[PDB]
Amino acid sequence: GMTDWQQALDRHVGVGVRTTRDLIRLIQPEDWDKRPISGKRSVYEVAVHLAVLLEADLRIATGATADEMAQFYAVPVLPEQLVDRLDQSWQYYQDRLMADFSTETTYWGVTDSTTGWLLEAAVHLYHHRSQLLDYLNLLGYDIKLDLF
Amino acid sequence: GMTDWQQALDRHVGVGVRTTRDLIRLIQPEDWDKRPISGKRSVYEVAVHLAVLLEADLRIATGATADEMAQFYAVPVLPEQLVDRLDQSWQYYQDRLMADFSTETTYWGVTDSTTGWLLEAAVHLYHHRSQLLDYLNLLGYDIKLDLF
Numbered sequence: 001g002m003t004d005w006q007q008a009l010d011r012h013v014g015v016g017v018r019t020t021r022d023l024i025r026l027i028q029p030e031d032w033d034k035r036p037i038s039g040k041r042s043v044y045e046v047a048v049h050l051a052v053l054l055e056a057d058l059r060i061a062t063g064a065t066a067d068e069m070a071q072f073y074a075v076p077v078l079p080e081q082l083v084d085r086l087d088q089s090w091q092y093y094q095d096r097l098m099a100d101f102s103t104e105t106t107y108w109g110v111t112d113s114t115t116g117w118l119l120e121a122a123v124h125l126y127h128h129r130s131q132l133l134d135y136l137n138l139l140g141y142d143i144k145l146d147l148f
Numbered sequence: 149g150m151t152d153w154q155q156a157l158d159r160h161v162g163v164g165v166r167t168t169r170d171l172i173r174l175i176q177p178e179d180w181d182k183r184p185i186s187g188k189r190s191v192y193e194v195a196v197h198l199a200v201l202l203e204a205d206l207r208i209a210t211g212a213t214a215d216e217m218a219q220f221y222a223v224p225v226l227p228e229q230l231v232d233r234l235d236q237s238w239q240y241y242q243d244r245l246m247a248d249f250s251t252e253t254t255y256w257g258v259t260d261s262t263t264g265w266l267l268e269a270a271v272h273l274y275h276h277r278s279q280l281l282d283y284l285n286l287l288g289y290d291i292k293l294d295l296f
């Protein structure tokens with residue numbers, strides 16, 4: 001079973017993940033290195049951050065070191081593995097969601113509860129899903145996907 | 149007192165609100181009617197939706213009718229009242245956050261728990277905060293605000 005907050009997170013983070021998966025599948029080959037907002041991440045770089053962040057944030061939450069995270073971020077996610085990678089991150093999140101895990105103060109020093117970290121990763125996901133959506137719309141995709 | 153999920157929401161939605169307030173205060177007079185993404189809301193229209201959505205969503209959640217919502221959305225929020233309006237919405241949210249409210253199936257028919265609706269309004273806030281940030285960065289503001 002699960003609590004009402006776990007149910008809420010599973011629902012809303014699952015929407016986040018399924019809609020992100022759909023957006024990634026829209027992306028055309030030509031567009032991966034495009035940077036619609038000069039100064040910011042490319043389409044592909046937004047996509048990779050989205051694909052890994054649900055796991056990254058929870059690893060950060062459980063005490064991963066700066067080097068451990070560098071090693072984590074350095075594992076390449078090629079465009080064809082992005083969905084597979086998102087799915088893996090979503091599974092990791094779901095397992096933490098249901099199991100009592102222990103949080104620790106992060107290496108750069110942010111402290112939050114297990115429940116707070118689970119919410120942080122959720123809103124971080126919606127932050128970057130929005131970014132990706134803005135990029136694709138900047139590129140003329142005119143997206144008509146139900147986001148809520 | 150409050151539960152661990154209420155604490156998490158108060159923390160993360162409060163960050164959302166304070167950072168949004170800061171972004172709105174950056175916006176220059178000339179930019180309010182600009183539409184950096186052709187086809188989408190203007191800067192001012194994103195800002196107004198952000199200012200009201202924490203209350204709008206919870207009203208929708210408690211059974212507001214289509215006409216009631218039309219009447220709600222039609223109340224004008226002038227650029228100089230935007231922060232005041234956001235603050236009002238945040239207060240409304242905080243009061244619902246702490247008090248057991250009853251949800252009803254929406255008029256267009258979405259059903260969710262009280263806890264799910266409180267999370268929905270949170271992720272909806274982060275969705276549009278991201279949009280506003282992308283717009284201002286599209287307009288050369290080069291924002292250096294800590295968003296998390």
Ligand SMILES: [Cl-]
Nearest residue numbers: 014017018090
């Ligand atoms: Cl799934």
Ligand SMILES: [Cl-]
Nearest residue numbers: 039040041042
């Ligand atoms: Cl970026």
Ligand SMILES: [Cl-]
Nearest residue numbers: 124127295296
């Ligand atoms: Cl981020």
Ligand SMILES: [Cl-]
Nearest residue numbers: 162165166238
């Ligand atoms: Cl405040």
Ligand SMILES: [Cl-]
Nearest residue numbers: 187188189190
């Ligand atoms: Cl829009």
Ligand SMILES: [Cl-]
Nearest residue numbers: 147148272275
């Ligand atoms: Cl929306």
Ligand code: NI
Nearest residue numbers: 049053124128
């Ligand atoms: Ni991020």
Ligand code: NI
Nearest residue numbers: 197201272276
């Ligand atoms: Ni919206």
